[PDB]
Structure formats: structure tokens, C-alpha cells
């Protein structure tokens, strides 16, 4: 059944709750972003109102074939009334089109639902600065102090420098980047830009990217693989067997592959810096795991929450085990006692 952490009290609303059939008493289904664990269950047969960003609404229409009459896109940073309740969508700094949602309940309670987010100090100067938030539905993916990672900017600088050096030493090297969802587009776009190439990909992935309102996108991507020296492949194909295979397909146009796997966190984060990362190599193939995250680090999460000073925190991630739930509740109390709210 629909878990309590997907329901917004005092409303008929639910958040990211499309896989339970009809939820009894739901008058509006919000969708924070187009990732499959969140939209799971949506299709062309859905006949309830879906509230979301413009970009998520482009993906619902074009990729899932949800009918236009049930898609209600809202602008960001704008007070909107939905079924009698004032709401605001804020950028979540996750993937394209991802939002946080502010609900202003008739009784005076204010609720923030972060969806999936990567906390940033810039959020401290959004419409959130303007009133008190009583309850926080929090993306707790990385809520443990071991989870450190570099800035997105640091990681992109590493990738750009690595790729440019490799291709300038060997003009017959191919760059490949893995993907299995929207998000992390800066990785492959920044590398293709430094190399003066467009990125080449499948027709399915090109169609996905043409939904994202990225400026000048026609200048940056293509379905013509042969004209491109940055290829995108399914993340599943980013291994020695899949890459050797792919290289056969290019007809001796290339003699070397340099590949990127943008992971979340991986335990080499606890020891090594970005400047010191090394690839796995077999023959003429090298695979780099780079820690490009679209979720808050522990310290970014902690800073956001100590700034916001909520009265109550409801985790939405890692809620399935008693050990995880207890661990998280201990950190929340530490933060509250340190900051004095
Ligand atoms: Ni997500």
C-alpha cells in the first residue's frame, strides 16, 4: 500500500506515488522528476491530473505517451493554486526538470518535499528564505558521514583535461560515456565541447535529450555515430567485453577507447582525491569511474537542514530497514542540538 511518506496531510495530494493504482482520496498526483523509481506505474492509460515541471511534462508526453489533457505543467518560482491549495515548484539541482515542492496548508502549516536533490547554498536565497517550514520530506540517499564527494565543477574539470590530453596524444582514440537515465548530461557535453565534436547516440536517447530545453541543443548532439568521436552507450555496455565489441562496430576508424562511468558514491571516495583517480585498463581500453553526484553529500545535506530548521523531518530514502531509520534519526538529533532549534 502507499507509504505514509508519499502522502501530504491536510490535502488530497500524493508525491511520486504512481505504482499503487488508485490511491483512495487522491485528487492530484505530483511527480518530482523523470526517474523510473519515481514515475513507476505511469503510462498512456493514466486518467488523473499530474502536476510537474515543463520538462518532466515533455518527457511524460513524448516518452511515456501520457495524454496531454492529464499533464499539468507549472512554472518554477511562482505561487500557483492547485485544488484550492497554494504550491510553489523550486529547482532541486538533481536532473533536468527535477523540482522540490512547497505546500502551504489551509491550517497554516508549510511543508517542503525535496524530491531528489543536491543541496546547495543557492537554495538559501530562493523563495524558501521568505517563511518558516514546519515539516521536511527529505532525500536522505547519502545521510552518513562517510559520504564525501567533490564538487560537480571539480569532476568536470578532471574529465575535460583527461579526455583532451588522451585524444591529442592519439587522434584515433574514441571517447565513450555511459548513461541509463536522464541526468549528468554535463559529463558528455563538456567532453564533446573540448574535443569539437557533437555527441553521438541512439535514436531513443536523442529523442529523450530533445525534451530537456537545453539551449542550442541542435548544435551539440547527433544520431550520426560516424561523424562523432564522443559516443553514448547504455551503462550496461561500459565494460571490456561491451567496449571491445563496440570498437569492432566502428570499422577500424579507432584503435583505442577511453570510457567514463559516472557513478554515485563508491568506497574509493573515503581514501582518494579527484586529482589521484586511475582507470581500469585491458589492452587498448581504459574505464574511468568518476564520482559525479546529483544527490547531496552528508555535509551539504546537514548545512541545508541546519539552515532551514524544520520542526519535523520525514526521510524518503533508505526507509526500509530499522537500522537505517535509527541511524538517520540520530543524525537529525545531533544536528538539531548543535544548531539549537
Ligand atoms: Ni532521481
UniProtKB/Swiss-Prot annotation:
Q: Which domain of life is it from?
A: Eukaryota
Listed result of changing residue 139 to N: Impaired nuclear focus formation, reduced interaction with PIAS and increased sensitivity to cisplatin
Q: What are the inducing conditions?
A: During mitosis. The mRNA encoding this protein contains an internal ribosome entry site (IRES) in its 5'-UTR. This 5'-UTR generally suppresses translation while specifically promoting expression during mitosis, when cap-dependent translation may be impaired.
What is the annotated localization of this protein? Nucleus
Q: In which tissues is it expressed?
A: Expressed in brain, heart, kidney, liver, pancreas, placenta and skeletal muscle.
Instruction: Please tell me, according to the UniProt entry, what happens when changing residue 295 to A.
Output: Impaired nuclear focus formation, reduced interaction with PIAS and increased sensitivity to cisplatin
Q: Which residues form a coiled coil?
A: none
Function, as annotated? May be required for DNA interstrand cross-link repair. Also required for checkpoint mediated cell cycle arrest in early prophase in response to mitotic spindle poisons. Possesses beta-lactamase activity, catalyzing the hydrolysis of penicillin G and nitrocefin. Exhibits no activity towards other beta-lactam antibiotic classes including cephalosporins (cefotaxime) and carbapenems (imipenem).
How is the quaternary structure described? Answer: Binds constitutively to TP53BP1. Binds CDC27, which is itself a component of the anaphase promoting complex (APC). Binds PIAS1.
Regarding protein family, the annotation reads: Belongs to the DNA repair metallo-beta-lactamase (DRMBL) family.
Under which name does UniProt file this protein?
DNA cross-link repair 1A protein
Q: Which organism is it from?
A: Homo sapiens
